[PDB]
Write a protein that binds this ligand. Structure first.
Ligand SMILES: Cc1ccc(S(=O)(=O)N[C@@H]2CO[C@H](CO)[C@H]2O)cc1
Ligand SMILES: Cc1ccc(S(=O)(=O)N[C@@H]2CO[C@H](CO)[C@H]2O)cc1
Length: 339
């Protein structure tokens, strides 16, 4: 374990140096060609772009400053960029450039052509336990890394897990990630993945990520999430009850792990006990996992996504292609000074 302690100490040193002195303004919009819209939201979109001089493809997240302000996401968007420019881990999508202009904020990330885990999960129905375990191990290591930096991720769900050319996970969307020593209070995340303490408006901590991992593993192995209902209010009632029904095809080890991750009492939840992540890593469901081999990407993946090359968009969906305009006048300059 000294090797792991020293790895995490170095990881924190390197994070803190970038955290304290964030990079800014490392590209500009007219250095890229727009290719395709890969995703949208209420205040931003993600575009496939190509750098005009190098030919490299990237996933460019574009946030409209005026909408970020209106939807009360200022602090969250500053968190997202400051954290992304400071982290470095094999299963996190890398931020290559960031910049802003009169209208928008831009985060230029590596493009992962294999698509969201969500698509592959829905296509296949459910993943076998070995397949879910391969992905789950990556998330465990990623959360060990993030939590050691005092970061809470807060948006684990299949849509945010991209599958790369080797079949490994790259986590995207740090819009809810936050550096938290102690507790935090914001209501955020997708309903099916919210821990009870979020729904109950409590001060919560990194244990919410371990709850979300329980939801993710259940959904991967069953094909649907454990607290499924038609409307958020009904989902929330199921979550706080914590009553779960496991499919009979689940192994006993999987059920036991999930009862401990989907523990309503955060003080009893795996990942949040005295032994921290080691209660998860040492659980019988992970007995076949070589944690070092996973980290080193030496395990052959269950599944390699089909795609033709680094510019292929076939694993992503089709969206209306809308203008990306830049106002002649600066909007919300003060709010985004640090970006
Ligand atoms: C003998 C045995 C080997 C592997 C597993 S396993 O738990 O790794 N996989 C299970 C078998 O097929 C289902 C879907 O994966 C699971 O219940 C269980 C039992
Ligand atoms: C965060 C992290 C912890 C351990 C390792 S590890 O490769 O030392 N294996 C456990 C890699 C990454």
């Amino acid at each position: 374990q000294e090797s792991v302690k020293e790895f995490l100490a170095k990881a924190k040193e390197e994070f803190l140096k970038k955290w304290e002195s964030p990079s800014q303004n490392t590209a500009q919009l007219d250095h890229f060609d727009r290719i395709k819209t890969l995703g949208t939201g209420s205040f931003g979109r993600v575009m496939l772009v190509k750098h005009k001089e190098t030919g490299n493809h990237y996933a460019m997240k574009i946030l409209d400053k005026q909408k970020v302000v209106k939807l009360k996401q200022i602090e969250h968007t500053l968190n997202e960029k400051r954290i992304l420019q400071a982290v470095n881990f094999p299963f996190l999508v890398k931020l290559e450039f960031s910049f802003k202009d009169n209208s928008n904020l831009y985060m230029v990330m590596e493009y992962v052509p294999g698509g969201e885990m969500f698509s592959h999960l829905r296509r296949i129905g459910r993943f076998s336990e070995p397949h879910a375990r391969f992905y789950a191990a990556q998330i465990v290591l990623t959360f060990e890394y993030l939590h050691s930096l005092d970061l809470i991720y807060r948006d684990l769900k299949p849509e945010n897990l991209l599958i790369d050319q080797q079949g490994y996970i790259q986590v995207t969307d740090f819009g809810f990630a936050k550096r938290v020593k102690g507790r935090t209070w914001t209501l955020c995340g997708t309903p099916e993945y919210l821990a009870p303490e979020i729904i109950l408006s409590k001060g919560y901590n990194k244990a919410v990520d371990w709850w979300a991992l329980g939801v993710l593993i259940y959904e991967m192995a069953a094909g649907y999430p454990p607290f499924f209902a038609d409307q958020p209010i009904q989902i929330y009632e199921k979550i706080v009850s914590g009553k779960v029904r496991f499919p009979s095809h689940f192994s006993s080890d999987l059920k036991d792990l999930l009862r401990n991750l989907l523990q309503v009492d955060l003080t009893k939840r795996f990942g949040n006990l005295k032994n921290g992540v080691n209660d998860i890593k040492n659980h019988k469901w992970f007995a076949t996992t070589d944690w070092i081999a996973i980290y080193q990407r030496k395990v052959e993946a269950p599944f390699i996504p089909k795609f033709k090359g680094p510019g292929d968009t076939s694993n992503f969906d089709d969206y209306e292609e809308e203008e990306i305009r830049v106002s002649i006048n600066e909007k919300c300059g003060k709010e985004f000074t640090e970006f």
